[PDB]
Short mmCIF file of C-alpha atoms and ligand atoms in Angstrom, two decimals:
data_model
loop_
_atom_site.label_atom_id
_atom_site.label_comp_id
_atom_site.label_asym_id
_atom_site.label_seq_id
_atom_site.Cartn_x
_atom_site.Cartn_y
_atom_site.Cartn_z
CA UNK A 1 -67.35 69.54 -217.58
CA UNK A 2 -67.70 69.35 -213.72
CA UNK A 3 -68.24 72.14 -211.10
CA UNK A 4 -64.65 71.97 -209.71
CA UNK A 5 -63.21 72.64 -213.23
CA UNK A 6 -64.54 76.28 -213.11
CA UNK A 7 -62.99 76.86 -209.62
CA UNK A 8 -59.70 75.25 -210.84
CA UNK A 9 -59.41 77.74 -213.79
CA UNK A 10 -60.09 80.68 -211.38
CA UNK A 11 -57.07 79.58 -209.22
CA UNK A 12 -54.77 79.57 -212.32
CA UNK A 13 -55.84 83.16 -213.25
CA UNK A 14 -55.65 84.39 -209.59
CA UNK A 15 -52.07 82.98 -209.42
CA UNK A 16 -51.26 84.46 -212.90
CA UNK A 17 -52.57 87.98 -212.00
CA UNK A 18 -50.74 88.15 -208.60
CA UNK A 19 -47.40 86.60 -209.81
CA UNK A 20 -47.57 88.79 -213.02
CA UNK A 21 -48.20 92.13 -211.19
CA UNK A 22 -45.75 91.51 -208.29
CA UNK A 23 -43.12 89.60 -210.30
CA UNK A 24 -42.91 91.87 -213.39
CA UNK A 25 -42.84 95.01 -211.16
CA UNK A 26 -39.77 93.39 -209.49
CA UNK A 27 -38.27 92.71 -213.01
CA UNK A 28 -38.71 96.45 -213.95
CA UNK A 29 -37.36 97.65 -210.54
CA UNK A 30 -34.34 95.23 -210.67
CA UNK A 31 -33.13 96.55 -214.10
CA UNK A 32 -33.28 100.15 -212.68
CA UNK A 33 -31.67 99.14 -209.30
CA UNK A 34 -28.85 96.71 -210.35
CA UNK A 35 -25.81 98.15 -212.22
CA UNK A 36 -25.09 94.74 -213.88
CA UNK A 37 -28.77 94.41 -215.00
CA UNK A 38 -28.77 98.09 -216.16
CA UNK A 39 -27.79 97.78 -219.87
CA UNK A 40 -29.24 98.67 -223.32
CA UNK A 41 -29.69 94.96 -224.20
CA UNK A 42 -32.12 94.71 -221.25
CA UNK A 43 -34.54 97.40 -222.68
CA UNK A 44 -36.23 94.43 -224.49
CA UNK A 45 -36.64 92.72 -221.03
CA UNK A 46 -38.53 95.79 -219.60
CA UNK A 47 -40.62 95.96 -222.85
CA UNK A 48 -41.50 92.20 -222.42
CA UNK A 49 -42.36 92.83 -218.69
CA UNK A 50 -44.72 95.69 -219.75
CA UNK A 51 -46.36 93.39 -222.41
CA UNK A 52 -47.01 90.74 -219.67
CA UNK A 53 -48.20 93.40 -217.16
CA UNK A 54 -50.93 94.79 -219.56
CA UNK A 55 -53.21 91.62 -219.46
CA UNK A 56 -53.01 91.34 -215.61
CA UNK A 57 -54.39 94.91 -215.02
CA UNK A 58 -57.62 94.95 -217.15
CA UNK A 59 -58.24 91.80 -219.42
CA UNK A 60 -57.51 88.86 -216.96
CA UNK A 61 -59.65 90.29 -214.02
CA UNK A 62 -62.68 90.55 -216.43
CA UNK A 63 -62.10 86.88 -217.51
CA UNK A 64 -61.98 85.85 -213.78
CA UNK A 65 -65.30 87.68 -213.06
CA UNK A 66 -66.79 85.98 -216.20
CA UNK A 67 -66.05 82.45 -214.77
CA UNK A 68 -68.20 83.17 -211.66
CA UNK A 69 -70.78 85.07 -213.81
CA UNK A 70 -70.75 82.15 -216.37
CA UNK A 71 -71.18 84.75 -219.16
CA UNK A 72 -70.31 88.24 -220.42
CA UNK A 73 -71.94 90.98 -218.28
CA UNK A 74 -69.66 93.86 -219.45
CA UNK A 75 -71.13 94.72 -222.90
CA UNK A 76 -69.51 94.98 -226.36
CA UNK A 77 -67.04 97.86 -225.57
CA UNK A 78 -65.32 96.04 -222.67
CA UNK A 79 -65.34 92.85 -224.84
CA UNK A 80 -63.67 94.67 -227.80
CA UNK A 81 -61.00 96.47 -225.63
CA UNK A 82 -60.27 93.34 -223.43
CA UNK A 83 -59.69 91.29 -226.65
CA UNK A 84 -57.55 94.08 -228.28
CA UNK A 85 -55.23 94.41 -225.23
CA UNK A 86 -54.82 90.57 -225.14
CA UNK A 87 -53.58 90.84 -228.74
CA UNK A 88 -51.07 93.64 -227.97
CA UNK A 89 -49.72 91.56 -225.03
CA UNK A 90 -49.40 88.15 -226.82
CA UNK A 91 -48.04 89.62 -230.15
CA UNK A 92 -45.73 92.07 -228.30
CA UNK A 93 -44.32 89.16 -226.23
CA UNK A 94 -43.16 86.94 -229.17
CA UNK A 95 -41.61 89.92 -231.05
CA UNK A 96 -39.78 91.18 -227.92
CA UNK A 97 -38.51 87.55 -227.54
CA UNK A 98 -37.13 87.71 -231.17
CA UNK A 99 -35.64 91.14 -230.35
CA UNK A 100 -33.70 89.55 -227.45
CA UNK A 101 -32.64 86.55 -229.67
CA UNK A 102 -31.23 88.95 -232.36
CA UNK A 103 -29.62 91.23 -229.68
CA UNK A 104 -27.84 88.22 -228.03
CA UNK A 105 -26.63 86.73 -231.37
CA UNK A 106 -25.23 90.17 -232.39
CA UNK A 107 -23.52 90.33 -228.92
CA UNK A 108 -21.43 87.10 -229.43
CA UNK A 109 -20.45 88.27 -232.97
CA UNK A 110 -19.33 91.72 -231.67
CA UNK A 111 -17.44 90.02 -228.76
CA UNK A 112 -15.43 87.96 -231.31
CA UNK A 113 -14.70 90.76 -233.85
CA UNK A 114 -14.00 93.61 -231.32
CA UNK A 115 -12.26 94.22 -227.94
CA UNK A 116 -14.87 96.82 -226.77
CA UNK A 117 -18.17 95.42 -225.37
CA UNK A 118 -21.42 95.43 -227.39
CA UNK A 119 -23.59 98.50 -226.67
CA UNK A 120 -27.12 98.28 -228.14
CA UNK A 121 -27.12 101.88 -229.52
CA UNK A 122 -30.60 101.61 -231.17
CA UNK A 123 -32.23 99.31 -228.49
CA UNK A 124 -35.13 101.73 -227.67
CA UNK A 125 -35.56 102.48 -231.43
CA UNK A 126 -36.12 98.74 -232.20
CA UNK A 127 -38.56 98.47 -229.20
CA UNK A 128 -40.68 101.36 -230.66
CA UNK A 129 -40.79 99.50 -234.04
CA UNK A 130 -42.00 96.28 -232.26
CA UNK A 131 -44.99 98.17 -230.74
CA UNK A 132 -45.62 99.80 -234.16
CA UNK A 133 -45.65 96.26 -235.70
CA UNK A 134 -47.79 94.84 -232.80
CA UNK A 135 -50.36 97.70 -233.19
CA UNK A 136 -50.40 97.14 -237.02
CA UNK A 137 -51.23 93.41 -236.49
CA UNK A 138 -53.96 93.67 -233.77
CA UNK A 139 -55.80 96.81 -235.16
CA UNK A 140 -57.41 95.10 -238.28
CA UNK A 141 -59.23 92.63 -235.94
CA UNK A 142 -61.50 95.44 -234.57
CA UNK A 143 -62.97 96.32 -238.03
CA UNK A 144 -62.91 92.65 -239.28
CA UNK A 145 -65.14 91.55 -236.38
CA UNK A 146 -62.92 88.58 -235.53
CA UNK A 147 -62.99 89.51 -231.79
CA UNK A 148 -65.85 87.89 -229.82
CA UNK A 149 -66.78 86.13 -226.55
CA UNK A 150 -66.07 82.37 -226.22
CA UNK A 151 -68.24 80.75 -223.49
CA UNK A 152 -65.89 77.72 -223.13
CA UNK A 153 -62.88 79.82 -221.96
CA UNK A 154 -64.99 82.64 -220.26
CA UNK A 155 -63.22 85.35 -222.32
CA UNK A 156 -63.33 87.80 -225.27
CA UNK A 157 -60.50 86.83 -227.68
CA UNK A 158 -59.51 86.28 -231.36
CA UNK A 159 -62.00 83.82 -232.86
CA UNK A 160 -60.05 81.34 -235.04
CA UNK A 161 -63.33 80.32 -236.76
CA UNK A 162 -64.46 83.86 -237.90
CA UNK A 163 -61.89 84.18 -240.75
CA UNK A 164 -59.46 81.40 -241.73
CA UNK A 165 -57.32 83.91 -243.76
CA UNK A 166 -56.80 85.98 -240.55
CA UNK A 167 -56.16 82.78 -238.48
CA UNK A 168 -53.53 81.35 -240.95
CA UNK A 169 -51.71 84.77 -241.19
CA UNK A 170 -51.57 85.00 -237.33
CA UNK A 171 -50.01 81.44 -237.15
CA UNK A 172 -47.62 82.02 -240.12
CA UNK A 173 -46.50 85.67 -239.50
CA UNK A 174 -46.75 85.91 -235.68
CA UNK A 175 -45.66 82.37 -234.56
CA UNK A 176 -43.91 80.32 -237.32
CA UNK A 177 -41.87 83.30 -238.73
CA UNK A 178 -40.67 84.57 -235.24
CA UNK A 179 -39.84 80.94 -234.17
CA UNK A 180 -37.66 80.24 -237.29
CA UNK A 181 -35.71 83.50 -236.55
CA UNK A 182 -35.29 82.60 -232.79
CA UNK A 183 -34.26 78.91 -233.43
CA UNK A 184 -31.67 80.16 -236.01
CA UNK A 185 -30.29 82.73 -233.47
CA UNK A 186 -29.91 80.29 -230.51
CA UNK A 187 -28.58 77.50 -232.81
CA UNK A 188 -25.85 79.91 -234.05
CA UNK A 189 -25.03 81.04 -230.45
CA UNK A 190 -24.75 77.38 -229.23
CA UNK A 191 -22.31 76.41 -232.09
CA UNK A 192 -20.14 79.50 -231.33
CA UNK A 193 -20.01 78.53 -227.60
CA UNK A 194 -18.89 74.92 -228.51
CA UNK A 195 -16.14 76.36 -230.80
CA UNK A 196 -15.02 78.64 -227.89
CA UNK A 197 -15.04 75.60 -225.52
CA UNK A 198 -13.48 73.21 -228.10
CA UNK A 199 -10.31 75.17 -229.00
CA UNK A 200 -7.11 74.67 -226.91
CA UNK A 201 -4.48 77.40 -227.32
CA UNK A 202 -2.14 75.66 -224.83
CA UNK A 203 -1.81 72.71 -227.31
CA UNK A 204 -2.41 74.22 -230.81
CA UNK A 205 0.34 76.84 -230.37
CA UNK A 206 3.23 77.91 -232.66
CA UNK A 207 5.56 77.93 -229.54
CA UNK A 208 6.02 74.11 -229.84
CA UNK A 209 7.47 74.46 -233.39
CA UNK A 210 11.27 75.06 -233.26
CA UNK A 211 12.54 76.02 -236.77
CA UNK A 212 11.25 78.37 -239.51
CA UNK A 213 8.08 77.59 -241.55
CA UNK A 214 10.15 77.18 -244.77
CA UNK A 215 12.60 74.94 -242.82
CA UNK A 216 9.75 72.83 -241.29
CA UNK A 217 8.06 72.42 -244.74
CA UNK A 218 11.34 71.39 -246.51
CA UNK A 219 11.97 68.90 -243.64
CA UNK A 220 8.35 67.53 -243.85
CA UNK A 221 8.42 67.16 -247.69
CA UNK A 222 11.92 65.54 -247.54
CA UNK A 223 10.55 62.88 -245.11
CA UNK A 224 7.79 62.05 -247.69
CA UNK A 225 10.34 62.13 -250.56
CA UNK A 226 9.11 65.30 -252.31
CA UNK A 227 10.76 68.64 -253.28
CA UNK A 228 9.68 72.20 -252.29
CA UNK A 229 6.29 73.44 -253.55
CA UNK A 230 2.90 74.80 -252.36
CA UNK A 231 1.85 72.05 -249.88
CA UNK A 232 -1.86 71.20 -249.45
CA UNK A 233 -3.15 68.90 -246.73
CA UNK A 234 -6.34 66.89 -246.02
CA UNK A 235 -7.04 65.22 -242.66
CA UNK A 236 -10.41 63.45 -242.46
CA UNK A 237 -12.43 60.23 -242.81
CA UNK A 238 -12.65 58.59 -246.28
CA UNK A 239 -16.39 58.64 -247.15
CA UNK A 240 -18.77 59.50 -250.06
CA UNK A 241 -21.23 61.88 -248.31
CA UNK A 242 -19.62 63.60 -245.29
CA UNK A 243 -15.92 64.73 -245.36
CA UNK A 244 -15.74 65.04 -249.20
CA UNK A 245 -12.43 63.19 -249.90
CA UNK A 246 -14.13 62.17 -253.23
CA UNK A 247 -14.40 65.91 -254.21
CA UNK A 248 -10.65 66.39 -253.48
CA UNK A 249 -9.63 63.19 -255.37
CA UNK A 250 -11.60 64.26 -258.50
CA UNK A 251 -10.13 67.82 -258.20
CA UNK A 252 -6.53 66.38 -258.22
CA UNK A 253 -7.43 64.51 -261.49
CA UNK A 254 -8.68 67.81 -263.06
CA UNK A 255 -5.43 69.55 -261.93
CA UNK A 256 -3.05 66.71 -263.06
CA UNK A 257 -3.40 67.73 -266.76
CA UNK A 258 -2.62 71.43 -265.94
CA UNK A 259 0.97 72.83 -266.18
CA UNK A 260 0.51 74.35 -262.64
CA UNK A 261 0.24 70.82 -261.03
CA UNK A 262 4.09 70.49 -260.94
CA UNK A 263 4.22 73.42 -258.41
CA UNK A 264 1.79 71.53 -256.06
CA UNK A 265 2.27 68.97 -253.22
CA UNK A 266 -0.58 66.94 -251.61
CA UNK A 267 -0.71 65.16 -248.21
CA UNK A 268 -3.96 63.15 -247.91
CA UNK A 269 -4.43 61.69 -244.39
CA UNK A 270 -7.31 59.40 -243.37
CA UNK A 271 -9.14 56.03 -243.62
CA UNK A 272 -12.61 54.68 -244.48
CA UNK A 273 -14.04 53.50 -247.83
CA UNK A 274 -11.65 50.89 -249.37
CA UNK A 275 -12.62 52.02 -252.94
CA UNK A 276 -11.73 55.67 -252.05
CA UNK A 277 -8.56 54.33 -250.31
CA UNK A 278 -7.66 52.62 -253.62
CA UNK A 279 -8.37 55.76 -255.74
CA UNK A 280 -6.03 57.83 -253.46
CA UNK A 281 -3.34 55.05 -253.64
CA UNK A 282 -3.74 55.01 -257.48
CA UNK A 283 -3.07 58.80 -257.70
CA UNK A 284 -0.09 58.38 -255.27
CA UNK A 285 1.55 55.87 -257.71
CA UNK A 286 0.82 57.91 -260.89
CA UNK A 287 2.01 61.22 -259.34
CA UNK A 288 5.11 61.79 -257.20
CA UNK A 289 3.62 65.01 -255.73
CA UNK A 290 0.70 63.11 -254.05
CA UNK A 291 1.32 61.30 -250.69
CA UNK A 292 -1.32 59.20 -248.85
CA UNK A 293 -1.20 58.35 -245.08
CA UNK A 294 -3.72 55.61 -244.12
CA UNK A 295 -2.39 55.16 -240.53
CA UNK A 296 -3.64 57.18 -237.48
CA UNK A 297 -1.31 60.08 -236.48
CA UNK A 298 -0.80 61.65 -233.02
CA UNK A 299 -2.13 65.20 -232.16
CA UNK A 300 1.58 66.15 -231.76
CA UNK A 301 2.43 65.20 -235.40
CA UNK A 302 -0.83 66.76 -236.76
CA UNK A 303 0.11 70.06 -234.98
CA UNK A 304 3.58 69.75 -236.64
CA UNK A 305 1.77 69.32 -240.04
CA UNK A 306 -0.44 72.46 -239.55
CA UNK A 307 2.72 74.50 -238.81
CA UNK A 308 4.47 73.17 -241.97
CA UNK A 309 1.82 72.99 -244.78
CA UNK A 310 0.62 76.09 -246.69
CA UNK A 311 -3.11 75.21 -247.00
CA UNK A 312 -5.57 72.84 -245.26
CA UNK A 313 -8.40 71.61 -247.49
CA UNK A 314 -11.75 71.06 -245.69
CA UNK A 315 -14.03 69.82 -248.57
CA UNK A 316 -16.82 68.65 -246.20
CA UNK A 317 -20.45 68.36 -247.40
CA UNK A 318 -21.75 68.63 -243.80
CA UNK A 319 -19.65 70.07 -240.93
CA UNK A 320 -21.48 71.28 -237.75
CA UNK A 321 -18.43 72.71 -235.89
CA UNK A 322 -15.32 73.51 -237.92
CA UNK A 323 -12.84 72.75 -235.07
CA UNK A 324 -10.37 71.43 -237.72
CA UNK A 325 -10.34 74.83 -239.52
CA UNK A 326 -9.70 76.70 -236.17
CA UNK A 327 -6.95 74.18 -235.12
CA UNK A 328 -5.28 74.70 -238.55
CA UNK A 329 -5.64 78.54 -238.26
CA UNK A 330 -3.92 78.37 -234.78
CA UNK A 331 -0.68 77.36 -236.49
CA UNK A 332 -1.04 79.71 -239.49
CA UNK A 333 -2.45 77.13 -241.95
CA UNK A 334 -4.75 78.90 -244.50
CA UNK A 335 -8.03 76.95 -244.99
CA UNK A 336 -9.67 76.21 -248.35
CA UNK A 337 -13.06 75.01 -247.06
CA UNK A 338 -16.69 74.51 -248.09
CA UNK A 339 -19.18 77.32 -247.30
CA UNK A 340 -21.05 75.13 -244.75
CA UNK A 341 -22.29 75.84 -241.17
CA UNK A 342 -19.52 76.30 -238.61
CA UNK A 343 -16.91 76.73 -241.40
CA UNK A 344 -18.74 79.84 -242.73
CA UNK A 345 -18.94 81.15 -239.11
CA UNK A 346 -15.17 80.54 -238.58
CA UNK A 347 -13.61 81.34 -241.99
CA UNK A 348 -14.03 85.02 -242.89
CA UNK A 349 -13.24 86.50 -246.37
CA UNK A 350 -9.78 87.70 -245.09
CA UNK A 351 -8.84 84.39 -243.32
CA UNK A 352 -9.35 81.78 -246.10
CA UNK A 353 -10.82 80.62 -249.43
CA UNK A 354 -14.52 79.63 -249.39
CA UNK A 355 -15.81 77.09 -251.99
CA UNK A 356 -19.24 75.66 -253.01
CA UNK A 357 -19.56 72.14 -251.48
CA UNK A 358 -19.59 69.12 -253.83
CA UNK A 359 -17.98 70.85 -256.85
CA UNK A 360 -14.56 69.39 -257.97
CA UNK A 361 -14.15 72.18 -260.56
CA UNK A 362 -14.74 74.98 -258.02
CA UNK A 363 -12.20 73.33 -255.63
CA UNK A 364 -9.57 72.85 -258.42
CA UNK A 365 -9.93 76.57 -259.32
CA UNK A 366 -9.60 77.53 -255.61
CA UNK A 367 -6.36 75.44 -255.39
CA UNK A 368 -5.12 77.28 -258.56
CA UNK A 369 -6.00 80.65 -256.90
CA UNK A 370 -4.19 79.57 -253.67
CA UNK A 371 -1.11 78.66 -255.81
CA UNK A 372 -0.87 82.14 -257.45
CA UNK A 373 -0.26 83.90 -254.09
CA UNK A 374 3.11 85.56 -253.21
CA UNK A 375 4.98 85.16 -249.85
CA UNK A 376 3.80 88.67 -248.71
CA UNK A 377 0.07 87.87 -249.40
CA UNK A 378 0.59 84.52 -247.58
CA UNK A 379 2.19 86.09 -244.43
CA UNK A 380 -0.78 88.49 -243.91
CA UNK A 381 -3.31 85.62 -244.43
CA UNK A 382 -1.48 83.49 -241.75
CA UNK A 383 -1.42 86.52 -239.38
CA UNK A 384 -5.22 86.98 -239.86
CA UNK A 385 -5.81 83.21 -239.31
CA UNK A 386 -3.97 83.46 -235.94
CA UNK A 387 -5.89 86.65 -234.95
CA UNK A 388 -9.24 84.90 -235.75
CA UNK A 389 -8.31 81.82 -233.64
CA UNK A 390 -7.27 84.13 -230.72
CA UNK A 391 -10.75 85.76 -230.50
CA UNK A 392 -12.37 82.31 -229.92
CA UNK A 393 -10.03 81.50 -226.95
CA UNK A 394 -10.56 85.10 -225.63
CA UNK A 395 -14.25 84.26 -224.78
CA UNK A 396 -13.36 81.19 -222.59
CA UNK A 397 -13.61 82.77 -219.02
CA UNK A 398 -16.97 84.48 -219.87
CA UNK A 399 -20.24 83.61 -218.02
CA UNK A 400 -22.66 82.28 -220.74
CA UNK A 401 -25.56 81.76 -218.20
CA UNK A 402 -27.67 84.77 -219.42
CA UNK A 403 -27.94 83.10 -222.90
CA UNK A 404 -29.44 80.03 -221.09
CA UNK A 405 -32.07 82.12 -219.14
CA UNK A 406 -33.24 83.94 -222.35
CA UNK A 407 -33.44 80.56 -224.15
CA UNK A 408 -35.61 79.10 -221.29
CA UNK A 409 -37.88 82.24 -221.51
CA UNK A 410 -38.40 81.44 -225.25
CA UNK A 411 -38.66 77.61 -224.80
CA UNK A 412 -41.43 78.07 -222.20
CA UNK A 413 -43.23 80.60 -224.49
CA UNK A 414 -43.14 78.03 -227.36
CA UNK A 415 -44.50 75.24 -225.02
CA UNK A 416 -47.32 77.55 -223.76
CA UNK A 417 -48.43 78.72 -227.25
CA UNK A 418 -47.70 75.68 -229.54
CA UNK A 419 -51.09 73.87 -228.83
CA UNK A 420 -53.07 77.13 -229.46
CA UNK A 421 -51.44 77.67 -232.90
CA UNK A 422 -51.92 73.95 -233.80
CA UNK A 423 -55.66 74.23 -232.88
CA UNK A 424 -55.66 77.48 -234.93
CA UNK A 425 -54.49 75.62 -238.09
CA UNK A 426 -56.97 72.74 -237.40
CA UNK A 427 -59.89 75.26 -237.05
CA UNK A 428 -58.75 77.28 -240.15
CA UNK A 429 -59.00 74.10 -242.35
CA UNK A 430 -62.82 73.79 -241.86
CA UNK A 431 -64.25 76.39 -239.37
CA UNK A 432 -67.80 74.91 -239.43
CA UNK A 433 -66.83 71.21 -239.01
CA UNK A 434 -63.63 71.32 -236.90
CA UNK A 435 -65.15 73.46 -234.05
CA UNK A 436 -67.17 70.45 -232.57
CA UNK A 437 -64.49 67.96 -233.86
CA UNK A 438 -61.85 69.43 -231.42
CA UNK A 439 -62.12 68.24 -227.73
CA UNK A 440 -63.24 70.86 -225.15
CA UNK A 441 -60.59 69.79 -222.57
CA UNK A 442 -57.81 70.39 -225.16
CA UNK A 443 -59.22 73.81 -226.20
CA UNK A 444 -59.64 74.99 -222.54
CA UNK A 445 -56.15 73.76 -221.45
CA UNK A 446 -54.50 75.42 -224.53
CA UNK A 447 -55.96 78.86 -223.68
CA UNK A 448 -55.20 78.73 -219.92
CA UNK A 449 -51.66 77.34 -220.60
CA UNK A 450 -51.14 80.45 -222.84
CA UNK A 451 -52.56 82.67 -220.03
CA UNK A 452 -50.25 81.06 -217.41
CA UNK A 453 -47.25 82.24 -219.51
CA UNK A 454 -47.94 85.89 -218.47
CA UNK A 455 -46.51 85.14 -214.95
CA UNK A 456 -43.65 82.70 -215.92
CA UNK A 457 -40.76 85.08 -216.92
CA UNK A 458 -40.34 86.67 -213.36
CA UNK A 459 -40.07 83.09 -211.89
CA UNK A 460 -37.48 82.06 -214.61
CA UNK A 461 -35.28 85.19 -213.96
CA UNK A 462 -35.32 84.45 -210.21
CA UNK A 463 -34.45 80.74 -210.55
CA UNK A 464 -31.73 80.94 -213.26
CA UNK A 465 -30.26 84.51 -213.13
CA UNK A 466 -28.15 85.38 -210.05
CA UNK A 467 -28.35 89.18 -210.59
CA UNK A 468 -32.20 89.06 -210.62
CA UNK A 469 -32.27 86.64 -207.61
CA UNK A 470 -30.04 89.01 -205.56
CA UNK A 471 -32.19 92.08 -206.44
CA UNK A 472 -35.53 90.34 -205.63
CA UNK A 473 -34.12 89.80 -202.07
CA UNK A 474 -32.70 93.40 -201.97
CA UNK A 475 -36.05 95.08 -202.92
CA UNK A 476 -38.17 92.72 -200.68
CA UNK A 477 -35.97 93.57 -197.64
CA UNK A 478 -35.56 97.36 -198.43
CA UNK A 479 -39.37 97.86 -198.68
CA UNK A 480 -40.04 95.85 -195.45
CA UNK A 481 -37.10 96.94 -193.19
CA UNK A 482 -37.88 100.12 -191.20
CA UNK A 483 -35.30 102.86 -190.44
CA UNK A 484 -34.77 103.58 -186.71
CA UNK A 485 -32.68 105.88 -184.43
CA UNK A 486 -31.09 104.32 -181.27
C1 JEV B 501 -54.24 81.54 -234.37
C2 JEV B 501 -54.76 82.35 -233.19
C3 JEV B 501 -54.07 81.91 -231.88
O1 JEV B 501 -53.99 80.71 -231.60
N1 JEV B 501 -53.58 82.88 -231.07
C4 JEV B 501 -53.63 84.34 -231.32
C5 JEV B 501 -54.70 84.94 -230.42
C6 JEV B 501 -54.17 86.22 -229.76
C7 JEV B 501 -54.51 86.19 -228.29
C8 JEV B 501 -55.61 87.22 -228.10
C9 JEV B 501 -55.70 87.96 -229.29
C10 JEV B 501 -56.49 89.07 -229.56
C11 JEV B 501 -56.43 89.69 -230.82
C12 JEV B 501 -55.64 89.16 -231.83
C13 JEV B 501 -54.87 88.04 -231.56
C14 JEV B 501 -54.90 87.43 -230.30
C15 JEV B 501 -54.14 87.73 -232.83
C16 JEV B 501 -54.32 89.00 -233.64
O2 JEV B 501 -55.51 89.62 -233.11
#
């Protein structure tokens, strides 16, 4: 390593210390100052700012002095405490990040189900549990003797080579586990935003339908040359592994032998596999209560169908966003759909029948259950379907930018700490052999990239959040503009 490399690392820490202290003090002040930033959900933000602030006050300055000293001149006590506080900061950061991810996911869910805004009643209570969990994780390292000075990075930290069992547990429980939780939270938020964006209440609206539902159904069934009965509808691509038309076709065959089949009517709409197109056409010939439509219908006629049929069958294997289920629910069509992502998020227990995907027996039984439902039970189901669709459209004028800032805060944390945890696993495999087998440049960059993270969040809040940006300017001016008397 050259001479300039040591001076380069010192610049990174000097920048980190200054931007951490000044920036995170602004983050704390802004939450207190701004009325819009002042909320229970932002207690986790202050807790994360405190976590970041800890390392800048005592650990980082000792690391900076150690670069110029080219060794540890502060004894064992300062080495033990400096390493312990680095643990509390790093562990506290990832768990506060999960705390925000769970808080935000619970916010969108509350916003859909209720008219009153989400108030994080136990926000401070969860923050106190995070620091009780953080303390429980970093404390065993003092008695285990896994905290020591590393000459390569000029600091006292957790030695990945002391105990592999401690190293693996740190990676698994305090990186992999929190990440899985966070990814699941932001993936579920993103799908719910696309469903809010996707729905169109100006098109999929009962206002466009003139007559009564019973009148519209009798008219629809008469056009297809069928009498009155519980009408079921399918509208999807004909394939063997995605939309599940094959599950529906096999379910009709199971039902055809039953005495209850006479009371049923089926409208299968779609195109795809010619073999599946033939199977549907075969059932259409054998049974006068089964009608197949292979041509492509207009949105106008599909909307007419949703407002006429009793049930919409969504027997999909994989469905990311159940826009079809919401569009059907808009016009009071009760969905019988597979318990798959998107569909499980849309269809509640009071707004439809949920079925195990890829089971023709479970679908046939669900169709039998749907059949034995009186006009009164049906009217309440349709009412609930409409109420559920309304809550999605309700969230359209909302500003979803805060969800993006929080996601960037996490994404940058993951980028900063991913190489360190990968090196951790590589060292844990063979502590004696992998220590020289790992390049010094990679090890040094991974630690200082992780250190640089302690000053990133105040920069992110300023660049992406308008409330934080406005307050940074407000505080900077207020503290530098003198009061005078003319
Ligand atoms: C796999 C290890 C890794 O890459 N990163 C965690 C090292 C962090 C940062 C400093 C510090 C101090 C004490 C402590 C821990 C840490 C984990 C639990 O005890």
